[PDB]
């Protein structure tokens, strides 16, 4: 399952030196738009439960709905319990964003589970945002870079998943220091910042 | 003045892309947030004002009025325009509770008052538009993605004064490398509001 390395950089000028650090690496831009939902008294959120859409595409548009459950961050290592992402249809997928209450409708596994694990249930959507990731591959190496665009300003993050994460941690760590990439863990996962309505400190 | 094409679809988006790939200079992230008094007095008029935030080494804002633009056969006209920066903070502090806007001290903002009184403003929501800009010698392009929460639409902007020849020239372009294009029919802001993308 999951378990990655998570750092918030410090600011806009951070990232852009990091970018250009690694620019030879780089593979791949995704623009991201994230869509979260959650039944009409909390049932996902108060049993730590995380359901979007996200929207991506290059040449072809795509769309996947993931529920992510139980993800715990200590000291910048994140790590969660239950993960499930199916493909979507795009055009569904936006018929639901602009009115959620119409994801009771649509069969697919991810939302039976749902039904199954907790009530039927009457949907909410609860907004979303834009991410704009950076994808780095070096042989044996992916590394992601994220600027996330909330309404209420920016946020940016490496993300590098290991198995290791400790091993890994030392070494990715000074090799920002040494480089003068400025950052520290991340406290929090992008929805919850989102949730927030504000920057962490 | 400036022209003004949609492209057709993602994959057109990207054949152009890479068409251009070597010309490219830069990309803006571009965060647009719209604004308008509680009687839609700025709408009525024609007039559109808004906040436009967008990155690189430094966070930047502009405020941004147009006003009375019109649209013929892909070619834009705006009937006047005004651009001051606007300081990045005080820009979300705006986007977060609009009716701040009415106490910060400002050109369009005194402007704006001057033509029609103190006014009580409302947000109008906003939309992430992805900008690439090519340049090449005296060639300034911008290719735009713009992504809305209903749907994502492809566009060329090409600045000039001469819209009819470049027009021309543009589209045989275009076509002989396999972009598929029309004329856009409606602004960004317009597309917006509608909730809805354009007729393909
Ligand atoms: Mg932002
Ligand atoms: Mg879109």
Not at 31 to 51: T, Y
Not at 171 to 196: C, D, H, M, P, T
Request: proline share 2%; hydrophobic share 35%.
């Amino acid at each position: 399952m999951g378990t990655e390395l998570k750092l918030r950089i410090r600011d806009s000028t951070a990232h852009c030196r990091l970018t250009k650090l690694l620019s030879a690496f780089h593979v791949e831009t995704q623009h991201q738009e994230n869509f979260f939902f959650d039944g009409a008294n909390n049932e996902l959120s108060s049993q730590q439960v995380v359901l979007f859409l996200r929207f991506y595409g290059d040449d072809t548009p795509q769309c996947f709905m993931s529920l992510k459950a139980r993800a715990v961050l200590d000291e910048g290592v994140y790590r969660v319990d239950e993960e499930v992402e199916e493909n979507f249809e795009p055009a569904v997928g936006r018929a639901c964003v602009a009115q959620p209450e119409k994801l009771s409708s649509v069969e697919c596994g991810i939302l039976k589970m749902l039904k199954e694990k907790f009530g039927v249930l009457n949907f909410v959507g609860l907004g979303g945002f834009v991410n704009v990731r950076d994808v780095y591959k070096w042989e044996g190496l992916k590394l992601e870079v994220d600027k996330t665009l909330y309404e209420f300003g920016t946020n940016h993050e490496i993300e590098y998943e290991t198995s290791d994460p400790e091993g890994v941690k030392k070494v990715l760590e000074e090799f920002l220091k040494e480089n003068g990439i400025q950052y520290s863990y991340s406290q929090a996962s992008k929805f919850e910042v989102f949730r927030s309505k504000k920057l962490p400190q």
